[PDB]
Design an enzyme around this catalytic site. Structure first.
Site, PDB file in Angstrom:
ATOM      1  N   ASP A 128       0.850  -1.185   0.000  1.00  0.00           N
ATOM      2  CA  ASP A 128       0.000   0.000   0.000  1.00  0.00           C
ATOM      3  C   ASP A 128       0.890   1.241   0.000  1.00  0.00           C
ATOM      4  OD1 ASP A 128      -2.092   1.817   0.292  1.00  0.00           O
ATOM      5  OD2 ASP A 128      -2.816   0.954   2.160  1.00  0.00           O
ATOM      6  N   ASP A 139      -3.962   7.082  -3.453  1.00  0.00           N
ATOM      7  CA  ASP A 139      -3.863   5.970  -2.497  1.00  0.00           C
ATOM      8  C   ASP A 139      -4.367   4.743  -3.244  1.00  0.00           C
ATOM      9  OD1 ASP A 139      -3.826   4.192  -0.280  1.00  0.00           O
ATOM     10  OD2 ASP A 139      -5.400   5.262   0.839  1.00  0.00           O
ATOM     11  N   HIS A 208     -11.949   5.807   2.554  1.00  0.00           N
ATOM     12  CA  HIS A 208     -11.931   7.158   3.087  1.00  0.00           C
ATOM     13  C   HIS A 208     -11.844   8.259   2.045  1.00  0.00           C
ATOM     14  CE1 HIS A 208      -7.595   6.933   2.296  1.00  0.00           C
ATOM     15  NE2 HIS A 208      -7.709   5.694   2.739  1.00  0.00           N
ATOM     16  N   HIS A 216      -6.726  11.100   4.944  1.00  0.00           N
ATOM     17  CA  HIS A 216      -8.070  10.789   5.435  1.00  0.00           C
ATOM     18  C   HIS A 216      -8.801  12.105   5.727  1.00  0.00           C
ATOM     19  CE1 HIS A 216      -7.510   6.339   6.861  1.00  0.00           C
ATOM     20  NE2 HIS A 216      -6.741   6.601   5.818  1.00  0.00           N
ATOM     21  N   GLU A 241     -11.190   1.100  -0.442  1.00  0.00           N
ATOM     22  CA  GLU A 241     -10.372  -0.052  -0.066  1.00  0.00           C
ATOM     23  C   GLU A 241     -11.123  -1.015   0.831  1.00  0.00           C
ATOM     24  OE1 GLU A 241      -7.003   0.757   2.745  1.00  0.00           O
ATOM     25  OE2 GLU A 241      -7.678   2.846   2.751  1.00  0.00           O
ATOM     26  N   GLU A 336      -7.048  -1.513  -3.099  1.00  0.00           N
ATOM     27  CA  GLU A 336      -7.470  -0.122  -2.970  1.00  0.00           C
ATOM     28  C   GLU A 336      -7.217   0.698  -4.229  1.00  0.00           C
ATOM     29  OE1 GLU A 336      -5.131   2.134  -0.026  1.00  0.00           O
ATOM     30  OE2 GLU A 336      -6.935   3.271   0.527  1.00  0.00           O
TER      31      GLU A 336
HETATM   32  C1  LIG Z   1      -3.802   7.859   8.735  1.00  0.00           C
HETATM   33  C2  LIG Z   1      -2.936   7.008   7.849  1.00  0.00           C
HETATM   34  C3  LIG Z   1      -1.564   6.862   8.138  1.00  0.00           C
HETATM   35  C4  LIG Z   1      -0.744   6.051   7.301  1.00  0.00           C
HETATM   36  C5  LIG Z   1      -1.296   5.413   6.149  1.00  0.00           C
HETATM   37  C6  LIG Z   1      -2.688   5.543   5.839  1.00  0.00           C
HETATM   38  C7  LIG Z   1      -3.273   4.885   4.660  1.00  0.00           C
HETATM   39  C8  LIG Z   1      -2.728   4.110   3.637  1.00  0.00           C
HETATM   40  N1  LIG Z   1      -3.703   3.714   2.765  1.00  0.00           N
HETATM   41  N2  LIG Z   1      -4.867   4.210   3.198  1.00  0.00           N
HETATM   42  N3  LIG Z   1      -4.619   4.909   4.333  1.00  0.00           N
HETATM   43  C9  LIG Z   1      -3.494   6.366   6.691  1.00  0.00           C
HETATM   44 CO   LIG Z   2      -6.565   4.235   2.042  1.00  0.00          CO
HETATM   45 CO   LIG Z   3      -3.791   2.816   1.030  1.00  0.00          CO
END
Ligand SMILES: Cc1cccc(-c2c[nH]nn2)c1
Ligand SMILES: [Co+2]
Ligand SMILES: [Co+2]
Length: 355
Positions: A128, A139, A208, A216, A241, A336
């Site tokens: 990811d 993302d 998200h 996010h 995702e 995702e």
């Molecule tokens: C808050 C946060 C911190 C680090 C990675 C994500 C992430 C990766 N893919 N979707 N969300 C979200």
């Molecule tokens: Co994400």
């Molecule tokens: Co992600």
């Protein structure tokens, strides 16, 4: 020019006119066109970031093999990613650390310095990672396996994610997307090492909304029934995702933390403490509100920064994001994509020939 075997030609050098390939364009399940054209430079930025993502992952899939350490995989992936996105401070770069969560661990795991973990033949690895241009974050993630015993688990999740992507749209109720995703996910049954499981969504994990320099944004897309009836709005960007698991279908904080991110809502905080003050300045200059990992700090020459980092977290200025894992012994999978809720259509901008 024409991209080389091992990537090295930035995406902007392959599209001289500045116009980048569009992702898949679907119809939701003049005026609205003028509006779409108005934010064209924004969409375009998303596309440039996606093209970087598509070529980076195809490269990864070409060499990722068991036997490699988790650190080698991430550093090789990130190196290529920096090159193609043509990293330029906060104008272009990596949106967040390379997640490569293993087995029962579903997300937020990336190796810190000294991690000697080695990818194994039976491992189920979730890659990811994100790229961004002017904070327009892409993302997108996929699951890596070497043992075909997970094929059905992977298909289940892939099918659930594309089902969430298809059900997404303007005025579409968010809880209806989660209800749909789960119904497809649980329509799958798998057998792994003489035991059978009905794939189940990880209820406390989710999709998200994405904001500029904010992975996010504020809205969540559930992957199970019983969610908020809040609707998706015109012009929003969403990270669709889903996660499938043979465990409890719930994740908990586990293992050492590697992911950190500044609290998007916190404002200026004057710090007199030397080390803590320095670390925060480094985070502001290099990451801003974008997530980062300890490896990205070591990379910048920082050392003896853990305590400073803890202060920032205790102060509420920085938030830790430890690995989220299901129970020991279980297997999890993820897929995702980032989609744009444009006025004239729905674009799965990160869509590729691969998935
Ligand atoms: C808050 C946060 C911190 C680090 C990675 C994500 C992430 C990766 N893919 N979707 N969300 C979200
Ligand atoms: Co994400
Ligand atoms: Co992600």
């Amino acid at each position: 020019k024409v991209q080389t075997d091992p990537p090295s030609v930035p995406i902007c050098d392959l599209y001289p006119n500045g116009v980048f390939p569009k992702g898949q364009e679907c119809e939701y399940p003049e005026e609205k066109k003028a509006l779409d054209q108005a934010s064209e430079e924004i969409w375009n930025d998303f596309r440039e970031a996606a093209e970087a993502h598509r070529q980076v992952r195809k490269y990864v899939m070409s060499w990722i093999k068991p036997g490699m350490t988790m650190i080698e995989i991430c550093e090789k992936l990130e190196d290529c990613s920096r090159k193609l996105i043509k990293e330029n401070g906060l104008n272009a770069g990596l949106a967040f650390p390379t997640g490569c969560s293993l087995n029962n661990c579903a997300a937020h795991y990336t190796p810190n310095a000294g991690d000697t973990t080695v990818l194994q033949y039976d491992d189920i690895c979730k890659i990811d990672f994100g790229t961004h241009i002017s904070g327009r974050i892409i993302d997108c993630a996929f699951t890596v396996t070497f043992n075909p015993k997970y094929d059905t688990l992977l298909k289940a999740v892939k099918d659930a994610t594309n089902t969430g992507i298809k059900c997404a749209g303007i005025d579409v109720r968010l809880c209806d997307v989660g209800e749909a995703i789960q119904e497809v996910m649980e329509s799958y049954e798998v057998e792994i090492d003489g035991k059978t499981y009905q794939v189940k969504p990880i209820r406390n994990l989710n999709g998200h909304s994405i904001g500029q320099y904010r992975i996010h944004a504020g809205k969540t897309v559930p992957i199970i029934k019983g969610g908020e009836a809040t609707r998706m709005e015109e012009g929003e960007v969403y990270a669709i995702e889903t996660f499938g698991s043979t465990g409890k279908g719930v994740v908990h904080d586990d293992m050492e933390c590697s992911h950190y991110m500044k609290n998007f809502d916190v404002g200026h905080v004057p710090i007199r403490l030397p080390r803590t003050k320095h670390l925060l300045n480094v985070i502001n200059e290099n990451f801003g509100t974008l997530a980062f990992c300890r490896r990205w700090l070591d990379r910048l020459g920082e050392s003896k920064y853990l305590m400073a980092l803890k202060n920032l977290c205790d102060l509420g200025i920085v938030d830790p994001y430890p690995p989220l894992c299901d129970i020991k012994g279980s297997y999890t999978a993820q897929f995702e994509h980032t989609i744009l809720l444009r006025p004239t259509c729905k674009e799965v901008v990160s869509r590729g020939d691969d998935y």
